[PDB]
Amino acid sequence: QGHMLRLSAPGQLDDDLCLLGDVQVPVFLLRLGEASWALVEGGISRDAELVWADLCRWVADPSQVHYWLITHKHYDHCGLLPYLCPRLPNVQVLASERTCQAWKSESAVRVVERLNRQLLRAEQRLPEACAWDALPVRAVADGEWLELGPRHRLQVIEAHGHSDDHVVFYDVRRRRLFCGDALGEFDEAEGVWRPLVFDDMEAYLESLERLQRLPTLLQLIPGHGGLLRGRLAADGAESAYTECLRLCRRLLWRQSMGESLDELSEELHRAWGGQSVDFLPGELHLGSMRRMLEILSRQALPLDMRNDGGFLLWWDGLRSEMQPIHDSQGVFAVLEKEVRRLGFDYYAYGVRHTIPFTRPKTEVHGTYPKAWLERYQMQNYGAVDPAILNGLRSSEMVVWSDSLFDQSRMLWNEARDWGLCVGATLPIRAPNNLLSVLSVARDQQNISSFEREEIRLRLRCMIELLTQKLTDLEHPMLMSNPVCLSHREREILQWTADGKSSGEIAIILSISESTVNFHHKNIQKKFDAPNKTLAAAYAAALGLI
Amino acid sequence: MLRLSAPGQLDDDLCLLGDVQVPVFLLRLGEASWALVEGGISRDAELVWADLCRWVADPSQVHYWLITHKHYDHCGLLPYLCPRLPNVQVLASERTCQAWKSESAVRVVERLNRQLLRAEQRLPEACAWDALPVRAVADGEWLELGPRHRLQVIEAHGHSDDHVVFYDVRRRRLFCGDALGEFDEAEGVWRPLVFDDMEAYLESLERLQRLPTLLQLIPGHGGLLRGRLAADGAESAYTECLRLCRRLLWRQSMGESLDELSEELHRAWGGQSVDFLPGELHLGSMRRMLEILSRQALPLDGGFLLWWDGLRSEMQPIHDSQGVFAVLEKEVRRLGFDYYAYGVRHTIPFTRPKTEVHGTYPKAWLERYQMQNYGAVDPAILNGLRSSEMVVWSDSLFDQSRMLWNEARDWGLCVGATLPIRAPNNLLSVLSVARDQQNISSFEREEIRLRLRCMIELLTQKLTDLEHPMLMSNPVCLSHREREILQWTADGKSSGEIAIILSISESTVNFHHKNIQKKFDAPNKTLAAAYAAALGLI
Ligand SMILES: O=C(CCCOc1cccc(Br)c1)N[C@H]1CCSC1=O
Ligand SMILES: O=C(CCCOc1cccc(Br)c1)N[C@H]1CCSC1=O
Ligand SMILES: [Fe+3]
Ligand SMILES: [Fe+3]
Ligand SMILES: [Fe+3]
Ligand SMILES: [Fe+3]
């Protein structure tokens, strides 16, 4: 440990972690147990004999290395594999499907080897290498839990943007993130991030957005520059997002004055290239500056779908995404997409009708575990569910909390058993006396106050738009009871619900009492009602009069 | 172009006078009424004056002069051009007016302004600093400058302990002085200018992010910004200030002195302000800002959301309804409208449903409205019975009730909108906003719609929490037994079936029916059931 904020020296960094080789292109070593080890980041080819040396100072046996984690495919994060895997018999390489496929293409591996060979020292000779498609690889998927060791459980997270394959690794026990290049190149002289967007900007920014939601970080480890800790590593993701949008503002401003991509590429190179001269030929750095300046000019918002440039932008984008939809399932799909973008796992949408007064129908549709739907409806938990009933009394969102469920212990216990441990519920009353409710749920993160206030707005807008579209599509869940009254029957009922008898209506409307009672009979027939009272009460409850 | 930076007209009501580096802004309030903004530097006195005589036929028509803060580069012209504007009121923050009474502050200003003359110019006649025709303004004060110029004052301490900014709500135009910083003409980003307090600087930028989306942003240096640059101005300035904070903290964690980064910043920034700032004061101000930042920066080991947080914080502590309505007025005028209304439509009597209203239209039109019971057949209110979408006022909407629309137009209520919401007790509450001369432009429409939705939600919540009478409904209370009996009767059950299900006698049940009727002043069971359903009681 130290009082420093950046640890950037070969050797030990934490009670389970070591930096091997050159701090510029480090390889990280994890002690999963007494005789079990793992590696992280693949570094560059030319360090093969350096890295090896350092490794043998900590590990008594290379056969005890069982796993090697690789963020992405670029030549500077997989160059050591072909040379050191022939020495690590028990190792599995772990990479994203795209990465494992990239190692099978002759073209990509040829690029990798050309760039890695450009990096040898004076009269350097390379030790024997094995085929790229001969590596002992096992592909991983987004969200997969890697049970490396008893105290090393790491989650895979897709972080496309930097490249079309990039992934990062979250050690949740120590709140430690291996982020590779997805945040960029850390400026060692200023303390800010240098964006590295080399495939897609929307995906880059959406990835940084999804990463801002992780628990507060204590340790942040990019592919270059060592390990960051404290505040520097806690607000890392937000800081990378900020610096990317700052470069966007710079580029767009310069282009509004008439500058070319190459011009700002040369300007940026002048002030940045100096850091990566040891492992990156200057011309590839300039070309990457030009490439990223290409993408930014393509996808950045000018200065005049759902995304990044302010809230109103997300609002209009959501609306525009929902206009062409003529199929309800797609409506629900878009809603799900935005719910996940908020940071939750499941959601639900419920409608509470006002009748029958003894047992008011409460219909539900969502994406909770189907078995929970079976149990919920089977035991009709939906009658006195606090999340829905709060809407009868308040227009505020209700964040799920033990105190709120004091009256309904069984429901809360069973929902907790199904993973629905954290969530929130917003209510809104449609203009037809209906109680519509929108709930969101996740597994392990409690709603922080700030995110609570954020949610309230985003969910309000989503549910407000959703009910509108479902009314335009006449969904069966909302259709309640399709009853249309004629103008005459409606005003007859308007009088009757005010207490008038057949005779008084006959007088007032200037028609006969027989006509009025026949109208009453028709009205009854529509409501499937046995008398006038049920018709009047349901019509009042349904807003028809 | 995206940045307008040339002397002369900038908009149909605005002109830039003098040097774009230290500009002075001119507003045409009317045919023979004008106003100024920014006090510039002394040495431009004869330049600016020239340009002024190109636009104003008579110098007596200049009636107001607005001053952001006391720095020498925003008040230097006053002693020299106020002697030429007989009818002008200077408008400034109290601290500024006090600074003008202290001999020391005026001496600093005078020395720094003298440093900037050319070896040729002679000084034109000048008046004393404590003799100026000054009028103090207050944070939030409404300045009814002109028929189409209603500007609000906003306190923006931080850059200096007195800084204030001015917001034209009609044009969504903000004069911000230096509270956001010095706009980088070569890069398009903000350079922080923190010369008094960092917390106040950042809180000022926060309060400014809460304004409606900006179309025109006018700092003390560099001209007028439009488009995206003006929308996220406050957000970007906030961000760049925190970026400088982290740069400083990192360098200090490596063992650098402030002098090092101060000289760096001078080398890379001072060139912009060489014409109006002696280089050594630029280095010293960089050092001052880096000192303040090093003092207050946190050690180590989106505008809409801000508006929302601010409104809530403003409306929770209030426990008296009149103040609630007052806050509503504040935000409505801040958006750019003149009057508002809040209405409640009860569901009964079904033939003559009570429609109560509270707002700020001319009392005579309310007399007229109720006199002709316009609340029954007002289309803006009736749209809420079938839709939760906002309604922009339009002839098609009012084709059905032409008389009401014609008379409302006669009173100036020519442009407006109305939002509907359903309180949790089956009441239809609606919120309207209105002005006279400007049509609702497309982008501001959706921004408005959203803000109105939020405001009315919180309003109905708070007034229910305050137990207002207009929301109060017919006071009838039932117990579980009689309530459940009514739940059964409203489901179509007869007296006998109810008695069977509840395990009591039928005489008991019909006597219960009488109980229920007595409260509603109802003649039979049907009226009771319908009113109970309409009131949400069963
Ligand atoms: O969100 C709601 C109201 C609607 C429930 O929607 C559901 C319930 C089960 C299956 C499905 Br699909 C949707 N209630 C919360 C309370 C805590 S658990 C829960 O469902
Ligand atoms: O805003 C409403 C509803 C009426 C509420 O306004 C009023 C009416 C009387 C006194 C007061 Br205060 C406010 N209607 C619109 C329709 C077009 S003009 C108009 O006022
Ligand atoms: Fe990379
Ligand atoms: Fe890299
Ligand atoms: Fe200033
Ligand atoms: Fe200034």
Residue numbers in the entry:
A (entry chain A): -2 to 301, 332 to 572
B (entry chain B): 1 to 301, 336 to 572
Report text from the authors:
The majority of traits controlled by rhl transcription factor RhlR depend on PqsE, a dispensable thioesterase in Pseudomonas Quinolone Signal (PQS) biosynthesis that interferes with RhlR through an enigmatic mechanism likely involving direct interaction of both proteins. Here we show that PqsE and RhlR form a 2:2 protein complex that, together with RhlR agonist N-butanoyl-L-homoserine lactone (C4-HSL), solubilizes RhlR and thereby renders the otherwise insoluble transcription factor active. PqsE is a thioesterase that triggers transcription of the RhlR regulon through a hitherto cryptic mechanism, which we identify here as involving a significant chaperone-like component that enhances the stability of RhlR via protein complex formation. In common with many other gram-negative bacteria, two QS circuits use N-acyl-L-homoserine lactones (HSLs) as autoinducers, namely N-(3-oxododecanoyl)-L-HSL (3-oxo-C12-HSL) and N-butanoyl-L-HSL (C4-HSL), which are produced by autoinducer synthases LasI and RhlI and activate the LuxR-type transcription factors LasR and RhlR, respectively.
